[PDB]
Point group: D2
Chain length 184, copies 4
């Protein structure tokens, strides 16, 4: 009855971090068009996901094109979504003796003041990994875990000897981009 | 007191799949060296992990070097670990109406015989994403989820209308490299 | 028909290696419809590219959807494209003293029978990198270069001591997935 | 003759961008020690490369451990090196009609004020790809190329129609992390 003459998407560009969402809106012309329904699509779906209502969620580093197409007339408009890297901001989770630093998408596990330090860790429902932590050269130890994604659940404990004799710590649970710590 | 004169690492090369392990052995010479301690290290810890006992675990595609160094004398030997891509052999986890195909590290969700299909999923402790599944053009629908890791836990269901009206399927859970299906 | 009534894409599923191409064709319904022009699109452009004439090139591992949309009527059909990874074969490029093995997308540089080996290399218009090659324990050396992609251009030479004294080899050029060598 | 007793790595932590370098140095205890030779190793070589003289180069985002081991004593110390992502800062390379935006490690090719736009590009010694650029909805066009690394050589031109005839722009060359443009 009142045909669509056009569509625009707002915002026309947005930056999100991996795991963050932005709501897009399709503006259909004329404003009294009978059928304002749109299909949302993305040309780079490993970068960004789009819901049936234009909610865009960053999945990985990159820039992609979200398009809205009118059910009436197949007019199409698009926005550019940039998914930005995790900031390299160091977030510390634990105490003076042990814990981890979040450094973008790597975790740096640390044990301070020992004879040796091992790390026991598991990621989501994969297997346990037992590793020797690297000596810094001063009684301190470090071990980087690489390339975590948003939602990755890491269970981890240490075996170390701070003098008395070898002890195991209680397993902690860390969720990538959900567990909070204190900045730099 | 008997000094270490050499070390060999066996096997000298090995291919594993991601999340598969292989036990290396360090042979310290001579057999009656008084210190037979070795440290295991990996030059490429993104690709494979090594335990203090030489258990090497494939983490991601590529080739790396695991070295054994003697505590006595710093004698060194090394092995080549090749971590092989997930095979592209199509495994079906589902039935004739809906489910997924595992195709290497991507999952292709499918719904057959509907007027529309949506997918509701979540990976690990990430947020639920809602997508419209892409029509093939014959009343069937697909939607790929890209780049899963060994242990990644996908929880999912569908909304579709096979004639009588929209219904939701029950929550299913897939664990990447663990959940089994029908190698079709 | 003057009008278009439907479209199907032929083939409906296809697999290529990264680097390879598959021609898609759109079967426009009415056998002899007026306008048989389609728009080709891809929902996973990291994985596969599609030409205006429906040629699909694999860019990176994964599975994606390529759609043809009719100019007349905006009928849409789609094909599933699987891009398989470089198989972890071993291709030798060199002689019995030095060269590299191509192992899927990593290169294993080797020098056999030396008192030390350095590798000097450069990838595309990137900077020169100098590395000490890891000793395997028997006067041989290896060094893996990780995650090369199709068309990556590597210039390399070695400094090693075969006993007589240090020499430099002549620079060689390798082009990833173009330069060939000795299979198995 | 004066032996070795210890080593520290200077600096003990450092951050670079992908493509960039930081010189590490081993401080060997006794500072008059006759043999100050170290071996440099890195545990995550996908992330960062180390020269036989302790120059570390960032190759890919993440955090890794670079170790110095004394030739005399094989005492060892470690530095933590963070490789930070190419910032998602928009650099415009082109003019008001056509060019590209560098947005982290993705390039967004654009053509403004056309009835259609195609992009012809080639990465390094890979194949030339042809793509229909995606219309924004206003007579402008866009097409992202994804996940370039430092030194990647992109040769491109455009076919577009500014109103009265398709024309081809001349070949341009972009060198990722080398070609400069104007920030935002
Ligand atoms: Cl993609
Ligand atoms: Cl690595
Ligand atoms: Mg895209
Ligand atoms: Mg390595
Ligand atoms: Mg896709
Ligand atoms: Mg590391």
């Amino acid at each position: 009855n009142v045909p669509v003459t056009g569509v625009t998407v707002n915002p026309t560009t947005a930056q999100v971090e991996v795991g963050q969402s932005v709501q897009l809106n399709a503006s259909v012309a004329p404003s009294n068009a009978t059928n304002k329904q749109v299909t949302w699509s993305v040309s780079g779906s490993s970068i960004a996901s789009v819901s049936p209502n234009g909610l865009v969620t960053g999945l990985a580093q990159g820039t992609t094109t979200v398009t809205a197409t009118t059910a009436d007339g197949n007019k199409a408009a698009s926005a550019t979504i940039t998914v930005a890297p995790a900031p390299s901001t160091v977030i510390v989770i634990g105490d003076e003796v042990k814990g981890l630093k979040k450094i973008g998408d790597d975790l740096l596990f640390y044990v301070n003041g020992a004879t040796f330090a091992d790390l026991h860790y598991k990621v989501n429902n994969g297997g346990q990994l037992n590793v020797a932590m690297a000596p810094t050269g001063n009684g301190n130890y470090t071990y980087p875990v690489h390339n975590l994604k948003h939602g990755d659940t890491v269970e981890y404990f240490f075996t170390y000897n701070p003098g008395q004799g070898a002890l195991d710590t209680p397993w902690q649970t860390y969720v990538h981009g959900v567990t909070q710590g204190t900045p730099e």
